[PDB]
Design a protein around this nucleic acid. Structure first.
Ligand code: MG
Ligand code: MG
Ligand code: MG
Ligand code: MG
Ligand code: MG
Ligand code: MG
Ligand code: MG
Ligand code: MG
Ligand code: MG
Ligand code: MG
Ligand code: MG
Ligand code: MG
Ligand code: MG
Ligand code: MG
Ligand code: MG
Ligand code: MG
Ligand code: MG
Ligand code: MG
Ligand code: MG
Ligand code: MG
Ligand code: MG
Ligand code: MG
Ligand code: MG
Ligand code: MG
Ligand code: MG
Ligand code: MG
Ligand code: MG
Ligand code: MG
Ligand code: MG
Ligand code: MG
Ligand code: MG
Ligand code: MG
Ligand code: MG
Ligand code: MG
Ligand code: MG
Ligand code: MG
Ligand code: MG
Ligand code: MG
Ligand code: MG
Ligand code: MG
Ligand code: MG
Ligand code: MG
Ligand code: MG
Ligand code: MG
Ligand code: MG
Lengths: 154, 122, 129, 80, 205
RNA sequence: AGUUGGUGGGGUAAAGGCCUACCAAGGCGACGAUCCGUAACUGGUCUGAGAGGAUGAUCAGUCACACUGGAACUGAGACAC
RNA sequence: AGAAUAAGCACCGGCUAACUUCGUGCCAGCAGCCGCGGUAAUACGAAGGGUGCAAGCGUUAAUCGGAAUUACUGGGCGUAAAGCGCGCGUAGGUGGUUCAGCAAGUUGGAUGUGAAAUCCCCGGGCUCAACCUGGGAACUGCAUCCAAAACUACUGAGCUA
RNA sequence: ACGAUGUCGACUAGCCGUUGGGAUCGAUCUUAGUGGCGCAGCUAACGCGAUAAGUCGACCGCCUGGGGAGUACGGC
């Protein structure tokens, strides 16, 4: 899929005899709005090259998630490092109540009513990691029915 | 903390102290100037800031800032002071309200001339 | 010092299921037997048996389906330090109904579904998903 | 029937009067753990027949002294 | 109060049609609606997410000519109700009396429809109404007073509406200048370019 | 130290150390007595997704006061705006 | 009868929607925080031009939120703040397994109460709204009965991990 | 006063030494200590890893930005 959103651009620097050497880091996400999504990060000397590298990285390792019509299955909590993330399904009129990186990931991933929140450190990379961990591990019904029939489990 | 530890002594909130001890819960107060002068700011910035020592009806003697390019305050002037911290100056915690009792506002002010008590050009 | 042996049951199951074992054995108890019967009837374990000879041993065999375990998150709710009790309309719902909550009521140990249908509350032992 | 309380006799030095301790378990409003509280009552024992440590029951009447408005009805069990 | 002054400057800023004139000739050949007002018109001007929400909210507000306090009142009352408050806002904002006068063909622009309503010329059910906020009930019969029934302004508005598409959720008897409002329009009956959930996200911060 | 309880008596519209003469040494307290500072209380109000946090303008229920400190009279009712 | 009688306030470096020029020259000054001003200042003061509100607009004082920053819901303690120098033990907290009983916690129901207004739901009346008002829900609590017995408590009898 | 790591109990791949001691046929098994590596898992990272800082339960002590200061006053 092709729906590009740019999450972060940052300027980093290393030291050599003589002075500084500056580089740029770009964090982006790529998806189609129908379930598939992935994220990528890229380093370069200038911003456009970093963004292009990040986009190419995101097109690789793009994953598929199971969603119940623009909304999640169940409330869930996930984490990465010192970042924590909580999401739960919402009704149709609700927008995307989420901040910064979470909003980008969820807009690209195809959900539309998510009512999400995050705790701890809000480093965009770690938050996107936590959101992918949360979305990747959702189960959807008739899959938790890996034991027996449907509607007897529910 | 274990539940028993919280039952024996529960978590407590430490109430925050005000940064304007004078003018107790009052939006602004009336006072009289005792000494108007100039002072120098901290290292990065550099200027000659104009401030006034004020004795308030509470009995507190404090120091207030005089904003705007010009002022007509003198010793024994009666002023109205409001809150507001001046970062550049140590100890100045209040501001003088322009054009309120004896400060007369600023002149030749055309942009945002309500913070400095200037009448409309008309 | 064995303050709470049902938590020991749940932790044994969790650890052995995390180590890709196929049999878990522990000292037996009637409450443990009831919880294991609920787990089997719900389909989270394959089978369980109870031994004999004065010091009975409870044995459980586990399910995996895919290369992952079946029980991916089980937790103890009413520990002997809090003792949670709930009414019918307040019985917690696990994963929006895709999991189960084990409840002890005057009509036995059941799930949140069965208690909600029977209109009876009780003590929330553990949650499973 | 008549509303009745039960407790243990912790003092009988007063003449024709005993002190009864009554337990109760109250849930914490916020932390939800049941904590153990106690109440002390002065009870009118007309026959002076109650020793310390007994388990007795009492009922409410009109005051017979200041801070004394309960009278015992029977001795449930006697401390050995 | 009301917004007054240049009624095309808003269209130039927003970047879309934003019907605010008679629509006789065109919009592009009146105001060159391709540069934002002011000295700086050719700047690319990438704007952050907050800018996007603000533009969408300002766009709908300027379409319907509603001030901020009233708009937030509508939003809160729509959030009170059930069923996708995001489109409840549009449903309610589409039932205003001046807007209904607009969509029956009695006024070429919302401003003159509001002029007609505020000047005691429309009877909702035989009773005069002179306020541009009366939420029209479903099944009402909007009419024009006899004294003003023979103005040229209404006639001109009528043939101007003659080529505007047809809303089809109201029906007008043109000979006697009578109108009837059957029901509030469905979401699909409106223009499918405005995304209302963006506004709901804006006020939820 | 009328301090906790008991007995005879007094007193109140009414139970009662409420008062009194004797009798016993009791009574309360780390589940915070006593003391210090502050403060009318509630239905409620403002915030918050909620759990909570802050608060007691208007309106309604109760309490207390009437220049300051005391006391009683009349009356069904006051220790009297 | 006659468009005649009736728009202002704040802001424009980032957070935060909205930019160019002229005058100053670490001065005059600005500032909620990062900070700005020493010769091309979108940060000072003025202009044009915009941006947000609107009979209001800003500043000040105070409360909660954001703050998961007192963390019950919902945090931590090797090195960032944080394990008593180490035992023994009082009050307190917690308690292996089986049988039976009880009915305090627990669960379900009924009755009394939880003033009226207020908040909430469905209506009605003011040209609409604010406002007024009918009925219900709610007041998550307490007390008194009835029923159940899985878990905790209590009583009795056991067993050895 | 240090393992800068509270006490008690239960589970979770292995390999190589060593101290006190049992069983089976030098080897194997087993038990209470004491060390070096290391899979899962955990951690901001360093690193921990059956002598957990992993997975759990019972109770206790303590923390809430840096200075002023573990100081002043009062008590013992
Ligand atoms: Mg942080
Ligand atoms: Mg301030
Ligand atoms: Mg007597
Ligand atoms: Mg009395
Ligand atoms: Mg108004
Ligand atoms: Mg005496
Ligand atoms: Mg007497
Ligand atoms: Mg007072
Ligand atoms: Mg909150
Ligand atoms: Mg109070
Ligand atoms: Mg008053
Ligand atoms: Mg009152
Ligand atoms: Mg006076
Ligand atoms: Mg007096
Ligand atoms: Mg009399
Ligand atoms: Mg009186
Ligand atoms: Mg901007
Ligand atoms: Mg300024
Ligand atoms: Mg210049
Ligand atoms: Mg300027
Ligand atoms: Mg403030
Ligand atoms: Mg705050
Ligand atoms: Mg909080
Ligand atoms: Mg906690
Ligand atoms: Mg912390
Ligand atoms: Mg130690
Ligand atoms: Mg000691
Ligand atoms: Mg010991
Ligand atoms: Mg000990
Ligand atoms: Mg003990
Ligand atoms: Mg015990
Ligand atoms: Mg039993
Ligand atoms: Mg009940
Ligand atoms: Mg009520
Ligand atoms: Mg029974
Ligand atoms: Mg040493
Ligand atoms: Mg130490
Ligand atoms: Mg440890
Ligand atoms: Mg251990
Ligand atoms: Mg190692
Ligand atoms: Mg750690
Ligand atoms: Mg400090
Ligand atoms: Mg010292
Ligand atoms: Mg020392
Ligand atoms: Mg000392």
């Amino acid at each position: 899929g092709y729906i590009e959103k740019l999450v972060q651009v940052n300027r980093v620097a290393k030291t050599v005899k003589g002075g500084r050497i500056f580089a740029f880091t770009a964090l982006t996400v790529v998806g189609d709005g129908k379930g598939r999504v992935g994220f990528g990060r890229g380093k370069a000397r200038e911003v456009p090259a970093a963004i292009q590298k990040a986009m190419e990285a995101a097109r690789r390792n793009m994953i598929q998630v199971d969603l119940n019509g623009t909304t999640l299955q169940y409330p869930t909590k996930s984490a990465h490092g010192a970042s924590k993330v909580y999401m739960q399904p919402a009704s149709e009129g609700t927008g995307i109540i989420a901040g910064g990186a979470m909003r980008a990931v969820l807009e690209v991933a195809g959900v539309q009513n998510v009512l999400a929140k995050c705790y701890g450190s809000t480093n965009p990379v770690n938050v996107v990691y936590a959101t992918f961990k949360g979305l990747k591990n959702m189960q959807a019904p008739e899959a938790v029915a890996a034991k027996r029939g449907k509607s007897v489990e529910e | 903390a274990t539940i028993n530890q919280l039952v024996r002594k529960p978590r407590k909130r430490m109430v925050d102290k005000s940064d304007v001890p004078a003018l107790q819960n009052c939006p602004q107060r009336r006072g009289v100037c005792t000494r108007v002068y100039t002072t120098t700011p901290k290292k990065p910035n550099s200027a000659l800031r104009k401030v006034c020592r004020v004795r308030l009806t509470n009995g507190f003697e404090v120091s207030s800032y005089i904003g705007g390019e010009g002022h007509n305050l003198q010793e024994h002037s009666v002023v109205l002071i409001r809150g507001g911290r001046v970062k550049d100056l140590p100890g100045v915690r209040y501001h003088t309200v322009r054009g309120s009792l004896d400060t007369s506002g600023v002149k030749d002010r055309k942009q945002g001339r309500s913070k400095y008590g200037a009448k409309r050009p008309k | 010092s064995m303050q709470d042996p049902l938590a020991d049951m749940l932790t044994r199951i969790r650890n052995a299921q995390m180590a890709e074992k196929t049999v878990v054995s522990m000292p037996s108890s009637k409450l443990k037997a009831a919880v294991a019967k609920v787990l089997k009837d719900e389909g989270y374990i394959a089978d369980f048996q109870i031994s004999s000879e004065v010091k009975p041993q409870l044995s459980i065999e586990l399910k995996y389906f895919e290369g992952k375990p079946v029980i991916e998150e089980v937790k103890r709710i009413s520990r002997p330090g809090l003792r949670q009790y709930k009414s019918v309309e307040q019985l917690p719902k696990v994963r929006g109904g895709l999991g189960v909550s084990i409840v002890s009521t005057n009509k036995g140990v059941m799930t949140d579904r069965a208690a909600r249908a029977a209109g009876v509350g009780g003590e929330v032992l553990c949650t499973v998903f | 029937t008549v509303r009745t309380l039960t407790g243990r006799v912790v003092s009988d030095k007063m003449d024709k009067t005993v002190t009864v301790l009554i337990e109760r378990r109250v849930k914490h409003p916020i932390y939800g753990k049941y904590v153990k509280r106690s109440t002390k009552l002065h009870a009118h024992d007309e026959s002076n027949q109650c020793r310390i440590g007994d388990l007795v029951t009492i009922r409410e009447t009109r005051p017979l002294a200041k801070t004394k408005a309960w009278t015992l009805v029977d001795i449930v069990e006697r401390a050995v | 109060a009301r917004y007054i002054g240049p009624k095309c400057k808003l269209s130039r800023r927003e970047g879309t049609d934003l019907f605010l004139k008679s629509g006789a000739r065109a919009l592009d050949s009146k105001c060159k609606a391709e540069n934002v007002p002011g000295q700086h018109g050719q700047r690319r001007g990438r704007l952050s997410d907050y800018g996007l929400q603000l533009r969408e909210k300002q766009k709908v507000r300027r379409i319907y000519g509603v001030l901020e306090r009233q708009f937030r009142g509508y939003y809160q009352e729509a959030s009170r109700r059930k069923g996708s408050t995001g489109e409840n806002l549009l449903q309610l904002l589409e039932c205003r009396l001046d807007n209904v006068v607009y969509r029956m063909g009695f006024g070429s622009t919302r401003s003159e429809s509001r002029q007609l309503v505020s000047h005691k010329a429309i009877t909702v059910n035989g009773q005069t109404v002179n306020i541009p906020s009366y939420q029209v009930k479903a099944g009402d019969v909007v009419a024009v007073r006899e004294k003003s029934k023979n103005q040229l302004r209404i006639a001109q508005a009528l043939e101007l509406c003659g080529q505007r598409g047809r809303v089809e959720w109201v029906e007008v008897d043109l000979d006697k200048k009578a109108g009837t409002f059957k029901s509030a329009p469905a979401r699909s009956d409106l223009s499918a370019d405005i995304n209302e959930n963006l506004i709901v996200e804006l006020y939820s911060k």
